[PDB]
Coordinates of C-alpha atoms and ligand atoms in Angstrom, one line a residue:
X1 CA -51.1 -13.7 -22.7
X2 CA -50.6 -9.8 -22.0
X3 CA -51.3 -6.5 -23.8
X4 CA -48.9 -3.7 -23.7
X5 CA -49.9 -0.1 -24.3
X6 CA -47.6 3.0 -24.1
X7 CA -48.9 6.3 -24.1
X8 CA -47.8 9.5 -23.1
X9 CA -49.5 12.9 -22.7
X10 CA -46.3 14.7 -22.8
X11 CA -46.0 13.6 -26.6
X12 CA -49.1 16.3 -27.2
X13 CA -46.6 19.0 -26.4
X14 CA -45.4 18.7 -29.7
X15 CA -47.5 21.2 -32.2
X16 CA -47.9 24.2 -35.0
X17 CA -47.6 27.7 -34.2
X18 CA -48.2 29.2 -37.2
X19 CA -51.5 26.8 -38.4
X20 CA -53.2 25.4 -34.8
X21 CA -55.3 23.6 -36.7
X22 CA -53.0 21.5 -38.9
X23 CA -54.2 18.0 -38.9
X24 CA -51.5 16.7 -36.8
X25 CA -52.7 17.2 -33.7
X26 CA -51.6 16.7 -30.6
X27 CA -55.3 15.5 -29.7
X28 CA -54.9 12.8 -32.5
X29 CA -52.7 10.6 -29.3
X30 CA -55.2 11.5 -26.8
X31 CA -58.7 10.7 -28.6
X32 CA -57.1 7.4 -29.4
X33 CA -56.1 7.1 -25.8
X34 CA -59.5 7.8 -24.7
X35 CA -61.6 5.5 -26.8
X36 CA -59.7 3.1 -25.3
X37 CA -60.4 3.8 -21.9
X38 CA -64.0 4.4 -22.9
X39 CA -64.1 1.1 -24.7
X40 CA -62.4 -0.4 -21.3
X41 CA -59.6 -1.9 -23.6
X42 CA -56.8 -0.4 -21.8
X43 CA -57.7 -1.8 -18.0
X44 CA -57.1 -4.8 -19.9
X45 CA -53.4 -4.0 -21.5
X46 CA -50.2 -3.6 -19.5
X47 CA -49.1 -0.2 -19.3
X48 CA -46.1 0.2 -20.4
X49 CA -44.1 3.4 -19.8
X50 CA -42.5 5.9 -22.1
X51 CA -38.9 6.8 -21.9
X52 CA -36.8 9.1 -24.3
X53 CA -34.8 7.5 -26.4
X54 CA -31.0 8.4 -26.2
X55 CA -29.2 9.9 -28.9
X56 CA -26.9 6.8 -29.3
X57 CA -29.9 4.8 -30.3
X58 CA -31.2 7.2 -32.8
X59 CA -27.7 6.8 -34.4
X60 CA -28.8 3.3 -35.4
X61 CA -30.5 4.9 -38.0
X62 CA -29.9 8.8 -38.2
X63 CA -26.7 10.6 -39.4
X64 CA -25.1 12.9 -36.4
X65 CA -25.9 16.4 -38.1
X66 CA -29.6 15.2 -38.8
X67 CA -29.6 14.2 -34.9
X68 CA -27.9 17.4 -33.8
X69 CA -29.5 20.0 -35.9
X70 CA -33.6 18.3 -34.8
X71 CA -31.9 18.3 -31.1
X72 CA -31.0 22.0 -30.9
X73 CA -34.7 22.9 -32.1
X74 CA -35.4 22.5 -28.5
X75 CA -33.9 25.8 -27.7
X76 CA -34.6 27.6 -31.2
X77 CA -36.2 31.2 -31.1
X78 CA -39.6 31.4 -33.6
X79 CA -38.1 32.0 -36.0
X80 CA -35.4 29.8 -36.3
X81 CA -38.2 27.3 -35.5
X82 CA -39.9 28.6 -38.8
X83 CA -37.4 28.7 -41.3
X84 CA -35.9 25.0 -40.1
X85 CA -39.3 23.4 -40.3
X86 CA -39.2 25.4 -44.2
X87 CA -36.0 23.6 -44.7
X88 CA -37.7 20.4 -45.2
X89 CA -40.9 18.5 -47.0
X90 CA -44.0 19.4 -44.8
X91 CA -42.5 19.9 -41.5
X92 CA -43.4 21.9 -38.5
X93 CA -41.3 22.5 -35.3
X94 CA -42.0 23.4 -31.7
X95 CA -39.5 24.0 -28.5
X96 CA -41.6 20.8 -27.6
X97 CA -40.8 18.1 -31.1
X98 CA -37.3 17.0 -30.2
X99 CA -38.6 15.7 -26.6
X100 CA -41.8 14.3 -28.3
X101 CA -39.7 12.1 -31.2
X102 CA -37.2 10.9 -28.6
X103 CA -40.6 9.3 -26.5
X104 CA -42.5 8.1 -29.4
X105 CA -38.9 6.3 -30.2
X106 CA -38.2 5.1 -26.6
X107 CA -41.9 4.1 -26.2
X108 CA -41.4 1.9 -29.2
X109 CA -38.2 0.6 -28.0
X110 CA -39.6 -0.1 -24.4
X111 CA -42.6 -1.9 -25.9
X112 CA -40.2 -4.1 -28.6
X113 CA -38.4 -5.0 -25.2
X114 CA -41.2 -6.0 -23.0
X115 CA -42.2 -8.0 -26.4
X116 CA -38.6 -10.2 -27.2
X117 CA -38.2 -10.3 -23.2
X118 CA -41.5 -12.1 -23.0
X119 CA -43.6 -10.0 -20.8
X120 CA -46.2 -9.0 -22.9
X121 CA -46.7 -11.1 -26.1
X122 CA -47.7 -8.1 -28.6
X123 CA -48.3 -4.1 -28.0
X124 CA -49.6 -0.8 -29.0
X125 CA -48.1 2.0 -29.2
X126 CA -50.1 5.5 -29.0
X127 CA -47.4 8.1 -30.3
X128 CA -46.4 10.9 -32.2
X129 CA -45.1 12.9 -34.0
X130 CA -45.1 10.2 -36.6
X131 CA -42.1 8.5 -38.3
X132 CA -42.2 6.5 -41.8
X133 CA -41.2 9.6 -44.0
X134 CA -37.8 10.2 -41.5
X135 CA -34.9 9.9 -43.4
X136 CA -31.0 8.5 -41.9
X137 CA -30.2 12.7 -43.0
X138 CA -33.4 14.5 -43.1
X139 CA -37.4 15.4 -41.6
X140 CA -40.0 14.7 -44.1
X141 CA -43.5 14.5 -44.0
X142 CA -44.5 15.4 -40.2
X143 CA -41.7 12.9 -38.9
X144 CA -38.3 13.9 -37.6
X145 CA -36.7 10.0 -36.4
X146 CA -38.0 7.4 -38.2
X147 CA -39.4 5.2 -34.8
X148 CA -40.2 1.8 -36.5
X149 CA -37.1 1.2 -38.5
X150 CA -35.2 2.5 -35.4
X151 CA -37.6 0.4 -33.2
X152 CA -36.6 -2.8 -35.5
X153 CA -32.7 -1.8 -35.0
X154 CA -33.0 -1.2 -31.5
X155 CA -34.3 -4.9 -31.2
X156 CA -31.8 -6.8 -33.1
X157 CA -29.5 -4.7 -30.7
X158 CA -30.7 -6.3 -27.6
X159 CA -31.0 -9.5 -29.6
X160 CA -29.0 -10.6 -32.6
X161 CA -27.9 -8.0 -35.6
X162 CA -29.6 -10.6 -38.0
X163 CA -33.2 -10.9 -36.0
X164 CA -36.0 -10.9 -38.7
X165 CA -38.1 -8.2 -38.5
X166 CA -41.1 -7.7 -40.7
X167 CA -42.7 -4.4 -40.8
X168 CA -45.8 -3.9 -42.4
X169 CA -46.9 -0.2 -43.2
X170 CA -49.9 0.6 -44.1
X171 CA -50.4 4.0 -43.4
X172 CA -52.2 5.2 -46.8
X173 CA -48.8 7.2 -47.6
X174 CA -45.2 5.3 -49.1
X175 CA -43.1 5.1 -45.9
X176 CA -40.3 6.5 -47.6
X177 CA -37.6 7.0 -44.8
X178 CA -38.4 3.2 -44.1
X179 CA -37.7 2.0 -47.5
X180 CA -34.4 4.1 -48.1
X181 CA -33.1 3.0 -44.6
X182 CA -33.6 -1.0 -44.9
X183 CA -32.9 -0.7 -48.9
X184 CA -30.0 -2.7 -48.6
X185 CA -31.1 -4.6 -46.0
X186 CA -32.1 -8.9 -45.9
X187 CA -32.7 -9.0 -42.0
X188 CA -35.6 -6.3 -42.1
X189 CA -38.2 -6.8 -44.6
X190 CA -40.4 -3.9 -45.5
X191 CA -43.8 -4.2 -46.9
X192 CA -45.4 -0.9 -47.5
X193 CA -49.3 -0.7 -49.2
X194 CA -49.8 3.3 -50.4
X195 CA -52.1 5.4 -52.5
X196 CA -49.2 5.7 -55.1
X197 CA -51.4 7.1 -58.4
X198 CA -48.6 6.9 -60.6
X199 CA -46.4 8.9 -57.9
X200 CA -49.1 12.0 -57.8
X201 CA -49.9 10.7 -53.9
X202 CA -47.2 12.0 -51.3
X203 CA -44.9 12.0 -50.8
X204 CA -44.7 12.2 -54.7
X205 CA -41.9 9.5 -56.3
X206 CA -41.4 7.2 -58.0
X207 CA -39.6 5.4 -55.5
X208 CA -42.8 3.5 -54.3
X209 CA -43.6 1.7 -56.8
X210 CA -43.8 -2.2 -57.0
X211 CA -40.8 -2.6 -58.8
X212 CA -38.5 -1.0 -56.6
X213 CA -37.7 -4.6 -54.8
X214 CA -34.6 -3.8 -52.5
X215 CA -30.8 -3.3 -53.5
X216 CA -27.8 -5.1 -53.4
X217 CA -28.2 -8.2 -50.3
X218 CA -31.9 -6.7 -49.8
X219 CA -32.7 -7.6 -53.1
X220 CA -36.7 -8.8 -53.0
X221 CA -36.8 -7.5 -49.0
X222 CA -38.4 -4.6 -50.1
X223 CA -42.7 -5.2 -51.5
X224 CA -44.3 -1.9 -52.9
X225 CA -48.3 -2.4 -53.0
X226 CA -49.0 0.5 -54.8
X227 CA -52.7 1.8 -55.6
X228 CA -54.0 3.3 -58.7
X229 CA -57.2 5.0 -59.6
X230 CA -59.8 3.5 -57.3
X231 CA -61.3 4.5 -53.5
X232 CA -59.5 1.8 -52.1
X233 CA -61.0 -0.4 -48.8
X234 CA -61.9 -3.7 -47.1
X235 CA -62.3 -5.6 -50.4
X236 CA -58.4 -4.6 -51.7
X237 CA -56.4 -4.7 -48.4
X238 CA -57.7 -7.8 -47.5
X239 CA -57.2 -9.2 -51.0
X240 CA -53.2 -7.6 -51.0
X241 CA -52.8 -9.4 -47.6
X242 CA -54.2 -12.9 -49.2
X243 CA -52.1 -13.1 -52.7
X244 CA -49.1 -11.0 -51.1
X245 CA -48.2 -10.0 -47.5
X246 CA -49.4 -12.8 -45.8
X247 CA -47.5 -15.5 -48.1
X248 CA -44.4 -13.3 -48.1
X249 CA -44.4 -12.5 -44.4
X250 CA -45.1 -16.2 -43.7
X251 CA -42.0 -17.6 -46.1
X252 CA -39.7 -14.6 -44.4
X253 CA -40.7 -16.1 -41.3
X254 CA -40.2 -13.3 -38.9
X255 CA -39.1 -12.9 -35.2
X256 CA -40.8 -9.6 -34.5
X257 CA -43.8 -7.8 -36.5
X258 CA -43.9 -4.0 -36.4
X259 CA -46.7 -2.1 -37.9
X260 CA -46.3 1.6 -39.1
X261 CA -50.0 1.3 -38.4
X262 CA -51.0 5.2 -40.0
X263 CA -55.1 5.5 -39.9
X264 CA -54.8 7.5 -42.8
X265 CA -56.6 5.1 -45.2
X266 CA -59.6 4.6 -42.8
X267 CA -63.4 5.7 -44.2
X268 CA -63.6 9.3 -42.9
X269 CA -60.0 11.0 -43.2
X270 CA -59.4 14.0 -44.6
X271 CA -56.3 13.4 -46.7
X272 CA -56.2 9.7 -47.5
X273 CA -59.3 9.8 -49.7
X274 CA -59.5 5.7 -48.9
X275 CA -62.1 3.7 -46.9
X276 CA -60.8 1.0 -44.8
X277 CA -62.8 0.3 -42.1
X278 CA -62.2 -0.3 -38.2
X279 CA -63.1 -4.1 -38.6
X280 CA -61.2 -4.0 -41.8
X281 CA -58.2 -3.0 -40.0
X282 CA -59.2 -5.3 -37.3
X283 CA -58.8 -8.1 -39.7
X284 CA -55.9 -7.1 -40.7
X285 CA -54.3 -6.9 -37.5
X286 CA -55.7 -10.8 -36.7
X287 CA -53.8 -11.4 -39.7
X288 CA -50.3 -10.0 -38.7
X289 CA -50.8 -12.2 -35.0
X290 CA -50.3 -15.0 -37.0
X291 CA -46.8 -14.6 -37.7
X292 CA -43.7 -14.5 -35.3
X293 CA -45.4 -16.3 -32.7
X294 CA -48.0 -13.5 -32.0
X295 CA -45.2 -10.8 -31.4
X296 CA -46.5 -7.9 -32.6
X297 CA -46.0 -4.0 -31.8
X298 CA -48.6 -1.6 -33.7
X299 CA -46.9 1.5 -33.9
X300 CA -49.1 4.9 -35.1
X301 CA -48.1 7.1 -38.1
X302 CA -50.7 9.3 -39.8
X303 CA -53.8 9.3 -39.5
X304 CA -56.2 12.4 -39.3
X305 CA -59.6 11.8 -38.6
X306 CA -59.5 11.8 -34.9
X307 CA -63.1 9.5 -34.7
X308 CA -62.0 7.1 -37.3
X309 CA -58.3 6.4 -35.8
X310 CA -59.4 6.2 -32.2
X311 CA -62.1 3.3 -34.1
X312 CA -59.5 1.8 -35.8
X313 CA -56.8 1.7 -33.4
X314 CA -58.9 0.4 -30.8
X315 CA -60.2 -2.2 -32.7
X316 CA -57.0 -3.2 -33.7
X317 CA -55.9 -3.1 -29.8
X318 CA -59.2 -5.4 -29.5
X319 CA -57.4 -8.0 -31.6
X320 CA -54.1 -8.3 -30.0
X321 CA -56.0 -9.3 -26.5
X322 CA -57.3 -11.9 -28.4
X323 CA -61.1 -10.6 -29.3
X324 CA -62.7 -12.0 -32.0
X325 CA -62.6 -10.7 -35.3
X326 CA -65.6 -9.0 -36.4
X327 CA -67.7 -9.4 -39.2
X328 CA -66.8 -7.2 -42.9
X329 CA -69.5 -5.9 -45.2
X330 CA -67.8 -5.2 -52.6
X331 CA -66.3 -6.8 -55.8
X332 CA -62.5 -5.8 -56.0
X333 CA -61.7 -2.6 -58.2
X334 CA -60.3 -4.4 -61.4
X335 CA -57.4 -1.6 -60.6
X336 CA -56.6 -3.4 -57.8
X337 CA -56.2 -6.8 -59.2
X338 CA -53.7 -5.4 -62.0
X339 CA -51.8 -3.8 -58.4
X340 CA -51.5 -6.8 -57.2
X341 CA -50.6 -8.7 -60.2
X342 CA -47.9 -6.4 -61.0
X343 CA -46.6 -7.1 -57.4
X344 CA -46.6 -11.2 -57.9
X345 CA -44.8 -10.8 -61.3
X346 CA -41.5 -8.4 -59.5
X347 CA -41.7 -10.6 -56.0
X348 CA -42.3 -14.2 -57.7
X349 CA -38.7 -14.6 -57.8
X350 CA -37.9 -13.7 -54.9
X351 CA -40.5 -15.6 -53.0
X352 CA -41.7 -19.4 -54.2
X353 CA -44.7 -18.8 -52.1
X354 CA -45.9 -16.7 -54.9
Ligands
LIG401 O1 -49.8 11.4 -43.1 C1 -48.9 11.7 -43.8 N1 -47.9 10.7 -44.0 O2 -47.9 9.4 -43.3 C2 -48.9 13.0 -44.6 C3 -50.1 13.4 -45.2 C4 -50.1 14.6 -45.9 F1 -51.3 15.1 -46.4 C5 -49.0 15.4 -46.1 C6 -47.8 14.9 -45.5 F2 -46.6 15.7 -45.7 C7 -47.8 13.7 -44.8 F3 -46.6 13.3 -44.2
LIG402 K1 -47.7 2.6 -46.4
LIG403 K1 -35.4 -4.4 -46.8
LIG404 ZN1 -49.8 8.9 -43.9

């Protein structure tokens, strides 16, 4: 009944020259590192170490120029640095990024190993830069290699090529890369809930919404919850989980959980403009242990209110070593409801749970 936890210092090496203050900061891995030990949550976990990932493994999911062109950043003058980072949707670049993605991906993949191996039965994983906006051929949105969906092909590579794997995102933004990658995809299904406001929210299409269902043999492996007009919190995640991911997940039946956990819809962030709580989240994490015989691996995206996502994260870290849930504090937005309805009516034939 163990805990693992990765976390690496040397993934704050990774950072903005031009705007120190952008919000994702390097300190955003540490605070959350530090609550825990505050909270004495991580005497409790197995440490598990970080490794880099090898470039063979982020061809699972990567094209070789994206690879190579991310890689040689590493010895990039400034302004090479600059206009590369310009070349894409909201990314920066440091001498330090390529090392930093290569150990938030190998952290994942040693923590997904320590998990289907049996020595610890779920994990966190402390890491950035993020990774659900990473395309197979491009950076987008503060993400160079897309860690989960690489994470979920690295274990059905030490597995089987068919193993199940659920991942659940819920980060406030559309994991994008995630979508595109497993689009065609019945062995890895991807449920993603997003501030979507009629594709206004980054990372701005319409690609995230409920209807979009999967393609070809992933047809219905792919579950947009998409929000509309309303501060979102507590009251609508939990109800999305009840009427959607939770009887999905369950009938999909998965081997291994991953969670693009992003903190970026918690009460407090600057960006999200949402207000899940740290019990909220904490409840939703019980939730997820239910499934795949407890193996689950919470992996950080976004996130940018360092208080709230070392709260959140540590709460959520509280429920994989078995704590008890705590107690919530709203009548569901009405806005909600028609979310989730829409959802039910594109997935109900897909899924007889629903
Ligand atoms: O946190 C994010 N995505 O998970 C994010 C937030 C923003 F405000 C802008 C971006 F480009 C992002 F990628
Ligand atoms: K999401
Ligand atoms: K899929
Ligand atoms: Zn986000």
């Amino acid at each position: 009944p163990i805990t693992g936890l990765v976390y690496d210092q040397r993934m704050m090496l990774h950072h903005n020259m031009w705007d120190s203050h952008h919000p994702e900061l390097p300190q955003r891995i540490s605070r959350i590192f530090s609550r825990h030990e505050e909270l004495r949550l991580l005497s409790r976990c197995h440490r598990i170490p970080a490794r880099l990932a090898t470039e063979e493994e982020l061809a699972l999911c990567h094209s070789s120029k994206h690879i190579s062109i991310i890689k040689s950043s590493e010895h990039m003058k400034p302004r090479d640095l600059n206009r590369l980072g310009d070349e894409y949707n909201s990314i920066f670049i440091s001498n330090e990024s390529y090392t930093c993605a290569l150990l938030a991906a190998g952290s994942c993949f040693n923590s997904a190993q320590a998990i289907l191996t049996g020595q610890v039965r779920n994990a966190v994983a402390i890491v950035r830069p993020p990774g659900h906006h990473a395309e197979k051929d491009t950076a987008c949105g503060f993400c160079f290699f897309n860690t989960a969906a690489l994470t979920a092909r690295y274990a059905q590579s030490i597995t089987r090529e068919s193993l199940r794997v659920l991942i659940v995102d819920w980060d406030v933004h559309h994991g994008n890369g995630t979508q595109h990658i497993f689009e065609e995809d019945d062995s890895v299904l991807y449920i993603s809930l997003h501030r979507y406001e009629d594709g206004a929210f980054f990372p701005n299409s319409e690609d995230a919404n409920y209807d979009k269902v999967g393609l070809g043999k992933g047809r219905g492996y792919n579950v947009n919850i998409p929000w509309n007009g309303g501060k979102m919190g507590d009251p609508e995640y939990m109800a999305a989980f009840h009427h959607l991911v939770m009887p999905i997940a369950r009938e999909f039946a998965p081997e291994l959980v991953l969670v693009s956990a992003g903190f970026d819809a918690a009460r407090g962030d600057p960006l999200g403009g949402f207000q899940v709580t740290p019990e909220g989240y904490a409840h939703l994490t019980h939730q997820l242990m239910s499934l795949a015989a407890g193996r689950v691996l919470i992996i950080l995206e976004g996130g940018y209110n360092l208080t709230s996502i070392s709260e959140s994260m540590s709460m959520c870290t509280s429920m994989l070593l078995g704590d008890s849930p705590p107690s919530l504090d709203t009548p569901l937005k009405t806005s909600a409801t028609v979310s989730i309805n829409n959802v039910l009516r594109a997935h109900a034939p897909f899924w007889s749970s629903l």
